[PDB]
Amino acid sequence: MYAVFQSGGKQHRVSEGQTVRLEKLDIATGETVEFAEVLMIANGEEVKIGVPFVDGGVIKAEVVAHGRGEKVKIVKFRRRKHYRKQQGHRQWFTDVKITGISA
């Protein structure tokens, strides 16, 4: 009982009632979001996508958090050429919990 859907350019396989982290979305932390772009739905019986994105499959998900990822330190260094550079990055992420998976 799991489904495959495309959210932020990268596909996720999520089972019922589990939390999945995906790219930042323009949704407030206390609102449900829709994912009608369901790549595949799996159950005891198997249903595939003759046309991409099934026919009526949707996924109900609730936003939980809108935090930032772990800091990543970017170092660029040229050997013997008197060039050093430092940078930091924290990627924005959105935690969402899957509430319901349709057929």
Partner 1 sequence: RLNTLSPAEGSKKAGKRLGRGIGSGLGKTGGRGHKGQKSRSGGGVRRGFEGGQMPLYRRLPKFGFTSRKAAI
Q: Point out which span in 35-43, 49-57, 80-88, 89-97 binds partner 1 (CB under 8 A).
A: 80-88
Choices 29-37, 38-46, 79-87, 88-96; region in contact with partner 1 by CB under 8 A: 79-87
- Residue number, 48 or 77, with CB nearest to partner 1: 77
Q: Is 54 exposed, middle or buried (0-12, 13-18, 19+ CB in 10 A)?
A: buried
80 lines the binding site for partner 1 (CB under 8 A): no
**For partner 1, how many residues bind (rule: CB under 8 A)?**
4
Establish if 18 lies at the interface with partner 1 (CB under 8 A).
Answer: no
Which of residues 50, 56, 82, 88 is near partner 1 by CB under 8 A? 82
14: which 2 tokens? Answer: 């999520």
**CB-wise, 18 or 87, nearer to partner 1?**
87
Contact between 90 and 24 (Cβ < 8 Å): no
Dihedral of alpha carbons 45, 47, 48, 50, sign: positive
84 alpha carbon, distance to own chain's centre = 35
Task: Give the separation between CA 65 and CA 96, rounded to whole angstroms.
Answer: 7
